[PDB]
A = this chain, B = another copy of it.
Amino acid sequence: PISADFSEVENAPSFLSLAENTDEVLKPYTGLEIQTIITNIVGDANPNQSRIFDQDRLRGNQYSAGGLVTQNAVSAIPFTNLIPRTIRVGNILVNSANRLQITETNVSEYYSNPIIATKLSEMISDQVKNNQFSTWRRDNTSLQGFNAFDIATINTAILPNGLSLESMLLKLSLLHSIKAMNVDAASINRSQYQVIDHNTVPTIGAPAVVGVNNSPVFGEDCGGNNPVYPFGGGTGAIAFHVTLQTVPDERKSYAIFVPPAILQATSDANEALALFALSMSEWPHALYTVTKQTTDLAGANAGQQVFIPTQSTIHIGGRRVLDLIIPRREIAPNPTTLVAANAMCMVRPQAGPDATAGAIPLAAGQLFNMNFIGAPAFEEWPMTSYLYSWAGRFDITTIRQYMGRLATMVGVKDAYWAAHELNVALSQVAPKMTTAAGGWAAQAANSAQQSDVCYSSLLTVTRSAANFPLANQPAADMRVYDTDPATWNKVALGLATAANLVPEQSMDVPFVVGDARASFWERLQAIPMCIAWTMYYHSRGITTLAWDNAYTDNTNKWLQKMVRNTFSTTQSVGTIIPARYGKIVCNLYKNMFHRAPAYVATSVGGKELHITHFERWLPGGTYANVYSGAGAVVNCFSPVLIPDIWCQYFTAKLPLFAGAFPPAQGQNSTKGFNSKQGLMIHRNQNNNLVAPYLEKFADNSSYFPVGQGPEINDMATWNGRLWMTTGNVQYLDYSGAAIVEAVPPAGELPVGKQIPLLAGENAPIELTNAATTCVPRYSNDGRRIFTYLTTAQSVIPVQACNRAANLARSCWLLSNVYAEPAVEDAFDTLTNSSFLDVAKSVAESAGEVPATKALTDLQAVDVSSLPSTSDPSNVLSQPAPLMSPPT
């Protein structure tokens, strides 16, 4: 919140107060929290009616330090998911000179909620045991038309991990994020196309066209009409089956049953099959492309401009070949001939409306010839082309309906919301800041600096070094959970369940799915993530070069622990453990925004720990820096990516060191802190250098002692900002010597990105659009960093710390409002009771059927011999169930 008087900044909460862990439960951050402030919309409304094409800026009056008032000043939204692939130069569209951004994931099995066999599987085992008294081969009922021997094999040897569903739901949310772009322009912000290319102006008159494998440069059309994997460079295989017996022996252990709860629609069922095939294979299967009509700043030149979505570049390794087992239409003997097999399909697979070339060409609408016993030749298709043909037909409303049918088998609300959080964390991206004196700056068009970019975590994104397909693989950026086919098979049929797998009474998905407003919201959810990470890095004074080398440094020992505990590299009792200091950022988010991040569970010996997206990053990336006006790098600062008005205008509570400078009000303007706060001024041998009041330990260190670093003090950081915010500071040593790190040209600070204005807008003035809170303190070689003024330049600021004088600073002219976290149809009121009881019954539906053990017992030869009597089912202990105990 913005301070109105110095009394408000002086009474702001300390940083340690906000990093305490909190116990209360909290609602999710939906992004409407920002929408109420930066837009007209007050209640639910048609996105097309609202023209949210023009709702993409912070706006407001600004006050200058000289006493003039600027009206209709603006600041751009920092994030976007679009990477320009053609760029404007000299008012003419031209191709990109820079290689594309890429992301890599770590994917592994981990323990989840403990799992248990259902009543129905106890039924199946009873059927086998009662059969054993006979000469007859029919062991058990064949569930949902699948072969009874297959139910017999699926119902055996369960894993103790539990099941996750995370990678699946990620692939589905990445694709939803990509197709969301395809709606009309009135519902997408202009700013999203010009976060990187600030010289282009998108036209409102046509919707953007999403396509596949089209890019002009660097071999980014991964085969074109003859598709191959963007990373592997190969091609997959996909084969369909009625029974497991036809699956080749080399890969019968990898097969996946396709549940018939999906495919229940009158239409779009073959499409549902293609989509389910997409959610369990490797991603990306192709490079998607957004194409939008755009024009020059004058609106003269016009053309189709090419963009690559970030979601289409992030790699999630999975299976390349796969085998799906289609539901049977009626219980029957397995087919021995082709016609018997084709006639027997519930949904018969076919190619989508888009022809492909190469070996095994696919015609649009082409049907598959089912595999069967005694078949002369095994049949299969390349998978990259099968996913290619349907790729242009997927859209948001169908993914919503699919996901809604999926909802009725298993819980998918929280899991999807978590995978969506991960989507937003890996996809929204901002360009690096430029230093300046004034309010705006940008790098040269079609330059390496223009396109260099960063995560909400202040880490730079790696680039490709060669033409697609990529011969080699980048270090992983983040670790996600995998979904095992075996336990998937057990759960899809009702043989097993766990607390995270329970169907939910809503029978419905998160609000973000199926909306045309989704891109705007995802763009707005990245903001809090950066606010929390920047508070994390700016609470301490380490410079970007020192982070950049911290992991291996042996100059200091504390810097190493500091780097090492910010990432996830610990495990215990077979499962993943969250980064030890990511919990601090998680704590900060809750205390500052009064909301709760989405989390998954991990079981450690049976105890549940929560893991948010903050705790799962991996070491190896480079930290964000800022460039000079000429494009030279600047190392001296703490990492930064966004201007601090975003931090301080969208919080309920903020640490004291980061607050805004208060408005002029008659005599009183700005104020500092002195020896009455326990601070002290630093002087050296040189009489023409002065540094502010600082912590008392600062007098007795020029190098930090090994095993120790700079402390949290909010007031000293405050005076550090007051010194920097004068236009003439020196970033120096205890003795007044130059530090090893590169420093900006004098008096400059990093500032936010420039975008073209609308009529009536003004550019931001002075330091009203700049990071300020990045006060350096820890040099790479272990020296302290000081901010010096000359004596004459020193007098007014020191008296201002003494509160005898006043400093003059610019501010936004804005008030504080932070909203509370917060529909029945007539038909819903008509049916509310029946919905209330049926929803309650579905929660226990599990593998349940009305028949009890007491009925089935009457049908048995011997009740005592039944495995259900001698082994009643229990939840599995972790990591392993007891085996061969000492009697």
Residues of A within 8 A of B (CB): 2, 4-5, 40, 42-51, 54-55, 59-61, 63, 65-69, 71-72, 186, 515, 517, 662-669, 675, 680-681, 683-688, 690, 699, 702-709, 711-712, 733-735, 737, 791-792, 795-796, 805-808, 811, 813-815, 823, 825-826
Contacts and interface: CB of A to CB of B under 8 A. Distances in A.
Contacts of A664: 69, 666
A2 B699 contact: no
Contact of A737 (B66, B685, B705, B709): B685
A513 to B, nearest CB: 13
B708 A826 contact: no
Contacts of A45: 683, 699, 703, 705-706
10 contacts: A2-B667, A40-B690, A49-B702, A55-B791, A65-B71, A69-B664, A69-B808, A517-B706, A683-B702, A685-B733
Contacts of A65: 69, 71
Given A72-B796, A712-B826, A734 B684 contact: yes
Contact of A705 (B44, B66, B709, B791): B44
A4 B703 contact: no
Contacts of A662: 666
Contacts of A186: 687
Contacts of A708: 44, 823
A732 to B, nearest CB: 11
Given A45-B699, A66-B69, 8 more contacts: A45-B705, A46-B704, A49-B702, A59-B795, A71-B808, A72-B796, A515-B706, A712-B826
A60 B815 contact: no
Contacts of A805: 59-61
A705 to B, nearest CB: 5
A685 B734 contact: yes
B5 A705 contact: no
Nearest to A690: B40
A788 to B, nearest CB: 13
Nearest to A61: B808
B703 A46 contact: yes
Contacts of A517: 706
Nearest to A5: B666
Nearest to A73: B796
Given A69-B65, A72-B796, A708-B823, A687 B50 contact: yes
A687 B44 contact: no
Given A49-B687, A705-B46, A61 B806 contact: yes
Contacts of A705: 43-46
A55 B2 contact: no
Q: Which 3 A/B pairs are nearest by Cβ-Cβ distance?
A: A51-B687, A663-B666, A665-B666
Contacts of A737: 685
Contact of A67 (B69, B704, B814): B69
A826 B685 contact: no
Contacts of A66: 68-69, 71
Contacts of A680: 699
Contact of A681 (B42, B47, B792): B42
A815 B668 contact: yes
Given A69-B65, A808-B71, A706 B666 contact: no
B51 A791 contact: yes
Nearest to A683: B49
Contact of A796 (B59, B63, B685): B59
Contacts of A46: 703-706
Given A669-B813, A792-B54, A703 B67 contact: no
A665 B668 contact: no
Contacts of A735: 684-686
Contacts of A712: 826
Given A49-B683, A68-B67, A42 B675 contact: yes
Contacts of A711: 826
Contacts of A703: 45-46, 48-49, 685
A48 B687 contact: yes
Contact of A4 (B666, B690, B734): B666
Contacts of A59: 795-796, 805
A709 to B, nearest CB: 8
A795 B667 contact: no
A519 to B, nearest CB: 15
A817 to B, nearest CB: 11
Contacts of A663: 666-667
Contact of A44 (B71, B665, B707): B707
Contacts of A49: 683, 685, 687, 702-703
Contact of A706 (B4, B44, B807, B815): B44
Nearest to A49: B703
Which of A5, A43, A49, A705 lies at the interface centre, i.e. has the most chain B CB atoms within 10 A of its CB? A49
Contacts of A796: 59-61, 72
B688 A51 contact: yes
A813 B667 contact: yes
A58 to B, nearest CB: 10
Nearest to A827: B712
A670 to B, nearest CB: 10
Contacts of A68: 66-68
Nearest to A734: B685
A683 to B, nearest CB: 6
Nearest to A71: B808
A510 to B, nearest CB: 14
Contacts of A42: 675, 681
Contacts of A63: 67
Nearest to A790: B54
Contact of A699 (B43, B69, B687, B702): B43
A795 B51 contact: no
A701 to B, nearest CB: 8
Given A675-B42, A791-B54, A791-B55, A706 B806 contact: no
Nearest to A814: B667
Nearest to A706: B44
B69 A706 contact: no
Nearest to A48: B687
Which of A666, A685, A699, A814 lies at the interface centre, i.e. has the most chain B CB atoms within 10 A of its CB? A666
Nearest to A516: B706
Nearest to A46: B703
A55 to B, nearest CB: 7
Contacts of A807: 61
Contacts of A667: 2, 4, 663, 811, 813-815
Contacts of A681: 40, 42
Contacts of A515: 706
Which of A704, A711, A792, A807 lies at the interface centre, i.e. has the most chain B CB atoms within 10 A of its CB? A792
Contacts of A733: 685
A515 to B, nearest CB: 7
Contacts of A811: 667
A661 to B, nearest CB: 12
A706 B47 contact: yes
A506 to B, nearest CB: 15
Contacts of A699: 43, 45, 680
Contacts of A690: 40
A729 to B, nearest CB: 16
Contacts of A806: 60-61
Nearest to A712: B826
Contacts of A72: 796
A818 to B, nearest CB: 16
Contacts of A688: 51, 54
Nearest to A56: B792
A824 to B, nearest CB: 10
Contacts of A791: 51, 54-55
Contacts of A668: 4, 815
